[PDB]
Nucleic acid binder design. Sequence first.
DNA 1: CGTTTTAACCGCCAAGGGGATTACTCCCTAGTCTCCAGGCA
DNA 2: TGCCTGGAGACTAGGGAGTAATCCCCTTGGCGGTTAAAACGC
Lengths: 92, 92, 101, 183, 102, 102, 96, 95, 82, 87
Amino acid sequence: RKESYAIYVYKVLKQVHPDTGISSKAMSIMNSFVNDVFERIAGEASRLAHYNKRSTITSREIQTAVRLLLPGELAKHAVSEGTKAVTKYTSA
Amino acid sequence: RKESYAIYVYKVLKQVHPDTGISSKAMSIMNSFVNDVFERIAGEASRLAHYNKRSTITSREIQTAVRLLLPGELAKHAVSEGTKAVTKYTSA
Amino acid sequence: NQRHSLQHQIRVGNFDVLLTTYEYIIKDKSLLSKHDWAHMIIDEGHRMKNAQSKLSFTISHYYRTRNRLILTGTPLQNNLPELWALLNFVLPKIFNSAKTF
Amino acid sequence: GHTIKDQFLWNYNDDSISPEEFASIYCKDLDMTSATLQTQIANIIKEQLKDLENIAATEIMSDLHVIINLTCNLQDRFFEDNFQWNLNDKSLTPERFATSIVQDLGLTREFIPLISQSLHETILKIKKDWVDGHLIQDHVPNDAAFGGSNWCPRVEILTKEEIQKREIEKERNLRRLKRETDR
Amino acid sequence: KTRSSRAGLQFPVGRVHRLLRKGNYAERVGAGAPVYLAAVLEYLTAEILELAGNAARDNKKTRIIPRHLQLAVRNDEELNKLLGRVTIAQGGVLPNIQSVLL
Amino acid sequence: KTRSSRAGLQFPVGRVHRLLRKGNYAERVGAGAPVYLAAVLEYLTAEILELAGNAARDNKKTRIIPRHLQLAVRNDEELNKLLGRVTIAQGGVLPNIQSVLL
Amino acid sequence: HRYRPGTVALREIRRYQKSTELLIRKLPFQRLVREIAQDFKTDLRFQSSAVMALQEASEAYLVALFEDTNLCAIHAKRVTIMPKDIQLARRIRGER
Amino acid sequence: RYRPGTVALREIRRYQKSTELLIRKLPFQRLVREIAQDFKTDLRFQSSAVMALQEASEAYLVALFEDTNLCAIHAKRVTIMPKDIQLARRIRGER
Amino acid sequence: VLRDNIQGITKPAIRRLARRGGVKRISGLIYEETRGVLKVFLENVIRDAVTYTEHAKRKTVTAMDVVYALKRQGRTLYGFGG
Amino acid sequence: AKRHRKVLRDNIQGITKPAIRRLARRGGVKRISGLIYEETRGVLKVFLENVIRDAVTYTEHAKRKTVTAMDVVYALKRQGRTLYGFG
DNA sequence: CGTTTTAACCGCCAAGGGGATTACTCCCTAGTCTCCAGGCA
DNA sequence: TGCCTGGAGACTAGGGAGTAATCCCCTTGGCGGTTAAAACGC
């Protein structure tokens, strides 16, 4: 097997645009972008938890990470959505 | 207790010129430089061992990190010193 | 330009035999594939060897004939790695059974 | 060499002037009369109509409440404001609400045909998603128990310093907001 | 019962949590960090995909190509600031001729 | 008995080993890698202090000040290329006259 | 029928900025990559994806540097890039 | 009055020889506090933090002045203009 | 309450900075541009430092957080920590 | 010459003048001087030298002899320039 | 812009060499406990 | 100079790393043919 973010990006695209498709090259580019953002946020949260002498990566660490990396509006909406997701995860 | 490379930098300085002194500001500068270089080399070696799916940081990883980070002659001198050091550590 | 002029002059098929090369079979497939063929003869059959080659694939996709003649001065390579390819090119006998031989 | 920018409401339900006579007088007034300009005007205000003729405030018959957050700009002292507006109400027309706003504040007369029009456009947007998933959740800005430290959300101030970035910001917000409905 | 459905997302919460665990970023990982990270990732992906779809529809194309991704990331100033140091293969450069050269 | 004495270096290999362990850089760490890294750091600090002492002796000073360290870093092209992005307190880089702006 | 200089240049600029085709041939760039890698280690193999990524990165860096030197030349009230323009661009970028 | 250009050279030599601070403490501290009031109110600052901010500001401004000086030299100009700084920040990739 | 303190940075300060940088002649319009770029740089650095402090549950900005912010934007500052 | 063609064209000359011309046209340059070619060739040579050295070090650390695409991706990512569409 | 040249691109032929695999071994480092002297106040 | 905790030594083991066995696919080197691209000149 070989794991990838292809089907998830495809589902998001079909949920935002039901007509327009996506090619293999664009899918690989999107997967690389997702991996880059993931590793950026992970390293940010890791060094943030290290600066506070902590050892548990929690929602606050990822929130600070996205507030530091994503500039301006891209931050705000994101964290809002994030909070929303968190709240929904507390619902079930 | 707090840790610092002050005494070690002082000893290294005394092993080059015993008459030349050093100020507290320069000592803190050297300590911060040591910390920054150590963090750089450690992160480089960690990501190198991760690229090879390894879980053990060995002398080869640090050697590759030094050859990637230090430019030219510095890198050569560093790797030579490291080899001599590990040889002297394995001899005893 | 001379090839295009010749193709234009004979675009209606006012010819008896068309003699071309594999390079012209491939490059000019956009014009020659429109005509149907009944019998084809290919010389230097040793280059046709690969069944998945661009030459054989182009021959298959461009047109379909009933009689196929292969001429060559020496049999397939000693190790006969693509003998089944020549067999399928010649007759539909080993096409569906070559994998077990 | 000069560009023209303006807004106006048509009310196409009557027929006393055509999109050609309006341009015939709008360019004669500006004294930039040109056949290409009159045709350019009749080539833009007709598509707006045909695109918006399908949406009318009739047969709504639904007590709907929405937090209208609009922003106006007249290339000097632009402003933004958000309040509670109840659909399915015919007593208060946006023109009267605009006259009230221009009367209470120290605003020139030219702001009356600016806040009303931009408000109608919002109404059309509120009616656009009404043709589909437009369920009205209890969206409140403030209360006391059922359905106030300060009125920081409820602001009608005017600002000279341009925050000329809302166009992308609103589109950024709107695109995510639309996907929020589906879940 | 997958946690993505509980949280209401389309991204794999379990895969993100596993990548956070085996990535040696820390010794422990909470339960809200994976869902939060997946939310940020899916928001960014949805924004980029929406912009790419709009760009493709403007170019009357129904299949997104790297050119559309480049146009969408360079038109929006926010993503341009975010991915300014990142080059995209087969994306080219946006057409921009100087006034002194026209 | 300290392992640094066996290796022959003055830097504490035990401290570097502990930092690499509790630094969450990997799941396991070797035994020769801390000694190697300590030797690299010792050589780097030796070069820096040697150049700083040379600069101080050139300026007729009996102590090392941040100005001497800055001069030693900016003079050597190798360290300049290595330390190009880092800024150091007590700045100023190189006294130089431009031949075109006399 | 001849055109005055400058118009065909603008047409080519528009054509190249519109398209995304590669402006460097595959085999010469691959041979140059192999020659440059011979100096670091001999008898080294190369995947097609590796040389393709190298070509893409090189073209991206080159077009970025060309945009920068064009801006630098326009700052000098000129329409001709010069070696000193590229040198100034590389010195300001810090990758000298 | 000397010929314009010699006091400039003397100041160049003096400031490149010295290693002192060029920005006063209190104005920079007030500016930092004013800028920090926007992101969060009722904050406090340490002297070391303000000193580090001042050192970083001085280093960045000296680097930018070197870059704009080179840019002005390229345009056959001994004087610097705002367009030079704008070009420097555009080439650096931050404008 | 502090507001409109950018005037604290005065023309002699910018002149001294330019002399340190090697500038021989400075136009009168340079000061505004230097003040603006200084304001935006301080805005970015102080925003990052305030985020660091808020994450650290502290009420006092420290030099360590300033060093971390400079590393985030990308630069290392010796002599103050980190 | 009938004896031999005597062709010794260097490998660095593979990137020819029209290639650099197309690159400059894509970059937005109207008129190009005649000395730009050698300068950009040297710049490209230095950049390729750096990237190839980094990729060779990366692939040698893993004891492999084939320079893969991921090695070049990591080499580019190290220098602060991430490339997409290859891994 | 023209005219002359020629090397790049698609197509074929052959081979062998690392990059993949899986299976077995093995010893290095992660602990855990017990001293202790180099490092800190 | 005095004090102590991080560092060091001895014992245990298991899992990651080293080494052998296996094989095919990607690569390398070369040639044919065509022609759009590269070179030289005014």
